[PDB]
Design a protein around this nucleic acid. Structure first.
Ligand SMILES: C[S@@+](CC[C@H](N)C(=O)[O-])C[C@H]1O[C@@H](n2cnc3c(N)ncnc32)[C@H](O)[C@@H]1O
Length: 93
RNA sequence: GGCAUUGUGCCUCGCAUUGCACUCCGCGGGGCGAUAAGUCCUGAAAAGGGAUGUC
C-alpha cells in the first residue's frame, strides 16, 4: 500500500478502553514523530482499530516498519498505511 | 431532585466482530452528567457544557 501520513492499526485488543487506548497509542508512536491526531472508536466497524495521523510521512513509514507485529496488550499490531488521506491532512495541502 | 420526551457520547456483561475512519450507533442485558467522552449544545474564539416540558 502507498505511503501516507496516517497508519491504520488493526488487530488491537478490543477490551482496552477508548481513553487508555488512544493515549497508549499516542505515547508509543510519539517516539517515531510528531502526531497530529489519533482516531479511535469501539463501535462495531471501528473496534480493534486505530488511525494515528503523523505530521511527516517519513515518521509513519519509520513507525510502520519498526512496530509491525509488536506485542501490544497481548496482541501483535497489524500496521498498514491508510488507504486514503485523513481529513485533517487532506485540507492542509 | 421526581416524571415525559430526547440530542451527545462512556463503562460493563453475553453473543458476535480482523473491521479503512473522520458522513462515526451490531444485537441483547445492565449502569451513567461524570469534562470522562462526545459526531450533540453555548461562545466570536479561547474555553465551557446536556436539553425541552413538567410536580
Ligand atoms: C434516552 S437514555 C440514553 C439512550 C442512549 N441515547 C442510547 O442510545 O442508548 C437517557 C439517559 O442516558 C444517560 N445518559 C445519556 N447521555 C449521557 C451522558 N452524556 N453522560 C451521562 N449519562 C448519559 C442518562 O442516564 C440519561 O438519564
Amino acid at each position: 500500500t502507498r505511503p501516507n501520513h496516517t497508519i491504520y492499526i488493526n488487530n488491537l485488543n478490543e477490551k482496552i478502553k477508548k481513553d487508555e487506548l488512544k493515549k497508549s497509542l499516542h505515547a508509543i508512536f510519539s517516539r517515531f514523530g510528531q502526531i497530529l491526531d489519533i482516531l479511535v472508536k469501539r463501535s462495531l466497524k471501528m473496534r480493534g482499530q486505530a488511525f494515528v495521523i503523523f505530521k511527516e510521512v517519513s515518521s509513519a513509514t519509520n513507525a510502520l516498519r519498526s512496530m509491525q507485529g509488536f506485542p501490544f496488550y497481548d496482541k501483535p499490531m497489524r500496521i498498514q498505511y491508510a488507504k486514503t488521506d485523513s481529513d485533517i491532512i487532506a485540507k492542509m495541502a
